[PDB]
């Protein structure tokens with residue numbers, strides 16, 4: 050039965066059990082994963098409102114100094130570019146990316162998107178023809194099976210992940226592993242099917258709009274935003290569009306129990322519906338840098354197109 | 365059918381026999397790169413472009429005996445695996461060579477039956493592609509998508525004019541969006557007859573998705589031999605971007621005052637929906653890595669055109 054979200058934990062909401070799965074407001078956890086930092090800022094003035102508690106250590110500045118400046122002063126070269134790329138009223142799915150040379154922290158990748166009157170800024174550390182070669186190989190795959198196999202093998206070669214599966218949704222939202230590339234010694238998940246509650250309904254809706262999400266370390270504690278609520282609204286900060294957003298504790302226990310240290314997945318979206326997932330596992334924690342993740346994002350789109358094409362060749 | 369090419373004493377091309385020019389077998393290439401053909405098994409260099417000596421820095425005869433194994437040691441096994449016998453002519457493999465004579469070359473290979481076609485071009489060596497991809501996806505409708513696409517391509521390439529040219533059901537073409545330098549004529553809204561892009565050229569554009577003319581006044585460079593030794597027949601060059609452009613179509617560019625021209629197929633439901641069409645007033649060799657960006661954009665636009673057309677119908 051579909052039911053509306055509970056309030057999050059920090060607003061006195063209940064703790065999540067197997068009973069109330071579909072009602073966890075996973076998009077507003079009030080916290081991020083510790084391998085990057087996040088700031089929120091007023092979309093018109095550029096006043097800095099919220100920051101992750103670890104921000105001082107990524108950005109090399111005291112909180113009170115950060116919060117006391119506008120983005121115009123903090124990001125003089127990027128602030129006008131942000132404002133042109135992310136105009137008021139734009140969708141929350143639109144992202145702008147730049148690379149910064151920050152004194153204390155080396156090269157940072159900056160990813161920005163806009164939710165209403167809020168700008169959300171994510172900072173992460175950042176670092177030949179493999180993509181072009183893959184694009185052509187995907188297109189020349191003769192059928193859906195060969196496409197799925199080429200796609201899994203390519204992603205594994207690009208990333209070094211221990212296990213890469215193509216996980217396809219059935220009409221009842223159960224899912225099945227239809228191809229996989231895996232490290233020697235791992236047991237096969239090929240042909241196994243998994244029940245529709247394994248990836249509940251509010252996560253599938255979110256995965257149709259925001260196409261990549263990850264868990265770099267399944268044992269890492271989440272880092273709170275400070276303050277936790279958006280001071281504009283005294284309400285929760287929407288993080289569904291932020292790759293740094295903390296992962297559901299329910300989902301992290303599910304991965305730990307499987308022996309997974311690091312998890313990543315790309316959505317494959319066909320005709321406006323979530324067709325499947327490029328799902329990756331690593332046994333140890335593992336951070337895939339932003340520019341490599343971009344390659345996977347591009348492959349997500351290519352695969353969406355090629356899945357349509359291969360399936361049309363099939364009636 | 366097709367007329368024989370000129371160099372096999374076929375008729376010269378007019379506006380009476382527009383549909384019958386064998387644009388895939390011109391026997392020559394554009395001079396900003398070099399092409400070798402080679403045997404699929406032996407790696408034996410069978411044809412070369414008369415200009416190969418320039419790019420490769422090799423005494424002419426040296427090449428036309430040697431083997432790819434010898435000539436490209438690191439690459440030759442990769443090719444063997446990447447382009448297995450029986451693969452499609454559409455499948456391409458690329459690498460960057462740090463080659464003694466020329467700082468860096470791009471190498472592009474595909475296979476047509478028993479022949480490997482190798483293309484060499486100068487090359488080199490950020491977020492504009494990722495930023496463009498998200499911009500295309502958030503365009504609210506087909507019109508805005510067209511506008512974003514043309515603007516994005518112009519910004520990435522510096523081309524004087526970028527158009528989105530859409531085919532009607534009878535192959536009548538219409539410029540539905542345009543991004544252009546100040547002080548050019550506007551081709552926005554204009555329609556053009558179907559024979560401007562003749563049937564045999566639309567079929568080729570459905571399979572091989574990027575073509576260009578780097579300099580509309582440059583002479584083609586012959587293949588030597590012109591005929592493939594294997595077959596004593598013309599080498600198919602339809603999947604080669606270095607392939608010489610139809611003199612008929614270069615005359616049409618010169619008469620417009622274009623000095624360089626590039627397009628990308630937008631393919632939807634197995635059919636040619638439209639072209640990303642680019643103009644430069646002067647000669648312009650777009651480097652291979654930037655062309656790759658446009659090739660990606662072509663696929664992304666193909667996806668988004670279907671998405672956007674579905675939310676009208």
Ligand SMILES: *C/C=C1/C(=C/c2[nH]c(/C=C3[NH+]=C(/C=C4\NC(=O)C(C=C)=C4C)C(C)=C\3CCC(=O)O)c(CCC(=O)O)c2C)NC(=O)[C@H]1C
Pocket residue numbers: 066067068069070071073075224226238243244246247248249252262295296297299300303312313314328329
């Ligand atoms: C009562 C709650 C439960 C629950 C919640 C939940 N699950 C996700 C997301 C995912 N669950 C996945 C499950 C699988 N992993 C596999 O390897 C297989 C099969 C081989 C299955 C079925 C997957 C793949 C995802 C997507 C993310 C990923 O790829 O790692 C969420 C949302 C997480 C978030 O967005 O932060 C939630 C809340 N899952 C259950 O099984 C029950 C106990």
Ligand SMILES: *C/C=C1/C(=C/c2[nH]c(/C=C3[NH+]=C(/C=C4\NC(=O)C(C=C)=C4C)C(C)=C\3CCC(=O)O)c(CCC(=O)O)c2C)NC(=O)[C@H]1C
Pocket residue numbers: 378379380381382383385387537539551556557559560561562565575576577608609610612613616625626627639641642
């Ligand atoms: C007797 C045959 C004729 C003919 C042949 C021909 N045309 C092409 C390719 C193209 N023609 C194009 C025409 C236009 N360019 C524009 O900018 C506009 C309008 C604003 C039109 C109508 C285009 C866009 C192409 C595609 C290639 C490109 O982007 O430059 C070929 C194929 C050449 C090749 O692939 O090597 C041929 C044989 N064109 C005619 O107009 C008649 C006279």
